[PDB]
Every structure is written in C-alpha cells, then in structure tokens.
C-alpha cells in the first residue's frame, strides 16, 4: 500500500522587469534600489532618471541626424550625468590610460678599452679560452647590457626632468620636487628593470669568475653546437641529408624534453598542491598526465644520452659511409 510516488514537480520561477532600456539606467536603478533610499528621493530620483533617458535618447537621435552644433546638448547630457553622479555619490573616480612606448638606441662602444670591459673579456679569454664564441656571447650580453642599461637610465633621467622643464636647466631636485603621484612609477619601473639588468650583469661577472668550465653534456653546450656547425665541417650531401634528418629529430627531441621539463615542474607543483585541495576533482587526470609527462621526460633524457654518445663518437671524422 506504501506508495509515496511523488507525482508533483515543484518548479517556481521569479519575474524580472526592465524599467528602462539601457544597462546604465538598469544597473543604476537596481543599484539605488539595493541601497534603499527615502520615498521622496526615490520618486524625484526615478523621475530625474527618466528625464535623462529622454535627453540621451533625443541626443543620440539628433546626433545621427546631425543637429548638435553648439555641442551644448552633448555637454548637457554629460554635465548632468557627472553632476547627478557626483551628487548621489555614484561618481567615485575615473581612470586614465596613457602610453607612448619607445624603441631606438643602436649605440656603438669601442671594444676592449675601459678596464671594466677588458677585465671580463681577458678574465675568460685567459681563465680558460673563451675566445671567439664564448667571448662573443659574453659581449653580446656585455655590450647589450651597456646599451640597454645606459639607455633605460637615459630614459628615467629623461622623464625625471619631464617635470621641471623650462627650456633652460632643471632645478635642485633629485626627482623634481613632486607631490608624490606621477613620475614615481616611471622612475621606479626604470630602476626595477635597470637594477634587474644590473644584477644580471653581476651574475655574468660571477660566471666569468666562477662560471668557469666544469660540466655540460645535456643541453646544447658543445654537442648540439658541434652538430649544428657540422654543416661547415666540410661534409657531403649524403652524409649531410642524413645528419640533417637525424639532427632535426634530435634537436626536436631535446627541445621537447626541455619544454616538458619546465611544464612538468610547474604542473608537478600545481598538482602536489592541488591534491591538498581537500575534495578530489582534477587529482585524477592531473596525476595521470603528471606521471605520463614524467615518464616521457625520463625516456627522452635517456634517448638524448644515447644519441649523444653516438652522434658524438660519430660526427667526428665523418667518413663517407654517412655515419
């Protein structure tokens, strides 16, 4: 006899009401309504709002027809908009975007003149034999640092004056006696990137004084490099084509390993932490692709290793049998 077969199926819904025809009048009205205001204020308010809608509407229309000359119309709608806003306190503060960007330097220093330069250049050139590609690279970043550092500095020092200009000469002021608001973020940013670059160059120094040769046979220290140049190592079409395809597969393999390596670490952290969520949702798939990626990662490394010993003990000489 027991049969609580719930036949009924409750499914009630609410009912909206577009009192206006604009997101503005909507968000606004709804806002005020949520804020709750006196009956007199609501009445006079709602009315005023209506008048505004009539003005803006009639405005856009007249604008399309081309009648707003004195511009007093658009100015009245805008003036009333801000006025009413600032009045009820619905104004607040509008933002302002501004940018000009820049990109032009070139520069061109001598070379090994200032001891600061010859110091490092000779440091590596002698500390080992970093003469040519190693030294060239050092310079790539060394001179690149000189131009980028004094360039950014010139910019920060350029804007710094962009406050006490007078087509004459800046007045006593480390950073133009400002009221703290502008130029602050510009000079700060300049110091952030320039200081960061400064630290970078400092590392370069420690590299030449500490980054001395030690170990390297995974990335592209000398291997992938010797292979890349191998093209100039007096080769032959056949031997080449073979070395080309082989390399492509290699460079592609190692490269991928690197990509999966970084993504693996990032995912690993996000995962390990995702497991602490305390619920279990993406832990499954996460752990899946996680272990998987790790697997292909290790396998890749092993591959690069084998191919490394081979391609290496092979490249050299480079007989006619392709090799």
As for the chain, the residues directly before each break of C–N over 2.5 Å are none
Token look-up 């191919």 returns 307
Q: Which structural domain, as residue segments, surrounds residue 145?
A: 111-215
Contacts of residue 26, Cβ cutoff 8 Å, sequence gap at least 6: 18, 19, 20
The reply to whether 211 and 222 lie within a common domain is: no
The reply to whether 123 and 77 lie within a common domain is: no
Cβ pair 108, 94 in contact under 8 A: no
Q: DSSP alpha helices (H): ranges in 210-282?
A: 223-230, 237-274
Is residue 97 in some structural domain?
Answer: no
Is residue 78 in some structural domain?
Answer: yes
DSSP conformation class of 279: S
CA 245 and chain centroid, separation: 35
Q: DSSP alpha helices (H): ranges in 101-212?
A: 115-127, 133-161, 184-209
Last residue in a domain, options 187, 215, 243:
215
The reply to whether 195 and 252 lie within a common domain is: no
The reply to whether 118 and 203 lie within a common domain is: yes
The reply to whether 183 and 211 lie within a common domain is: yes
- Residue 73 parent element (H or E): helix 72-88
Tokens of 172: 């006593």
* Among candidate residues 177, 109, 118, the one with its CA nearest the CA of residue 145: 109
The reply to whether 125 and 176 lie within a common domain is: yes
Is residue 4 in some structural domain?
Answer: no
Cβ pair 254, 224 in contact under 8 A: yes
Tokens of 216: 């390297």
CATH number at residue 298: 1.20.81.10
What does the angle CA 26 – CA 35 – CA 76 come to, to the nearest 5 degrees? Answer: 50
CA dist., res. 234 & res. 230, Å (int): 8
In angstroms, the Cα distances linking 87 to 31, 37, 190 are 15, 14, 40
* Among candidate residues 192, 187, 202, the one with its CA nearest the CA of residue 154: 187
Tokens of 150: 């004094």
Listed as own residue / partner, the contacts of 244-250 with beta carbons closer than 8 Å and 24 or more positions apart are 246/311, 250/224, 250/304, 250/307, 250/311
Contacts of residue 80, Cβ cutoff 8 Å, sequence gap at least 6: 52, 55
Tokens of 46: 């709602």
Listed as own residue / partner, the contacts of 178-181 with beta carbons closer than 8 Å and 24 or more positions apart are none
Last residue in a domain, options 194, 215, 236:
215
* Helices 115-127 + 184-209 axis angle, to 10: 40
Length of the chain: 323
Is residue 85 in some structural domain?
Answer: yes
The reply to whether 133 and 193 lie within a common domain is: yes
The reply to whether 116 and 70 lie within a common domain is: no
The reply to whether 308 and 257 lie within a common domain is: yes
The reply to whether 322 and 222 lie within a common domain is: yes
* Among candidate residues 121, 143, 142, the one with its CA nearest the CA of residue 132: 121
* Among candidate residues 144, 120, 319, 134, the one with its CA nearest the CA of residue 225: 134
Is residue 102 in some structural domain?
Answer: no
Is residue 96 in some structural domain?
Answer: no
Q: Give the number of domains in the chain.
A: 3
The reply to whether 277 and 301 lie within a common domain is: yes
Tokens of 252: 């592609």
The reply to whether 283 and 263 lie within a common domain is: yes
Is residue 64 in some structural domain?
Answer: yes
Is residue 10 in some structural domain?
Answer: no
Last residue in a domain, options 215, 241, 267:
215
Contacts of residue 110, Cβ cutoff 8 Å, sequence gap at least 6: none
Cβ pair 243, 235 in contact under 8 A: yes
Contacts of residue 89, Cβ cutoff 8 Å, sequence gap at least 6: none
């Amino acid at each position: 006899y027991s049969r609580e077969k719930n036949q009924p199926k409750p499914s009630p819904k609410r009912e909206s009401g577009e009192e206006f025809r604009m997101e503005k009048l909507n968000q606004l009205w709804e806002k005020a309504q949520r804020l709750h205001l006196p009956p007199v204020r609501l009445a006079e308010l709602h009315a005023d709002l209506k008048i505004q809608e009539r003005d803006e509407l009639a405005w856009k229309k007249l604008k399309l027809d081309g009648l707003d000359e004195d511009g007093e119309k658009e100015a009245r709608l805008i003036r009333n908009l801000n006025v009413i806003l600032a009045k009820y306190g619905l104004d607040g503060k509008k933002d302002a975007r501004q940018v000009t960007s820049n990109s032009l330097s070139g520069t061109q220093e001598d070379g090994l003149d200032d001891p600061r330069l010859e110091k490092l250049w000779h440091k590596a050139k002698t500390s080992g034999k970093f003469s040519g590609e190693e030294l060239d690279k050092l310079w790539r970043e060394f001179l690149h640092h000189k131009e980028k550092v004094h360039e950014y500095n010139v910019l920060l020092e350029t804007l710094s004056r962009t406050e006490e200009i007078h087509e004459n000469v800046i007045s006593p002021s480390d950073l133009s006696d400002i009221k703290g608001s502008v130029l602050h973020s510009r000079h700060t940013e300049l110091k952030e990137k320039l200081r960061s670059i400064n630290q970078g160059l400092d590392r370069l120094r420690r590299v030449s004084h500490q980054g001395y040769s030690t170990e390297a046979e995974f990335e592209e220290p000398r291997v992938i490099d010797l292979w890349d140049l191998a093209q100039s190592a007096n080769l032959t079409d056949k031997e080449l084509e073979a070395f080309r395809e082989e390399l492509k597969h290699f460079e592609a393999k190692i490269e991928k390993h690197n990509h999966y390596q970084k993504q693996l670490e990032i995912a690993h952290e996000k995962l390990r932490h995702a497991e602490s969520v305390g619920d279990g949702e993406r832990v499954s798939r996460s752990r899946e692709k996680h272990a998987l990626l790790e697997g292909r990662t290790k396998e890749l490394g092993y591959t690069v290793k084998k191919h490394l010993q081979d391609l290496s003990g092979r490249i050299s000489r480079a007989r006619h049998n392709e090799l």
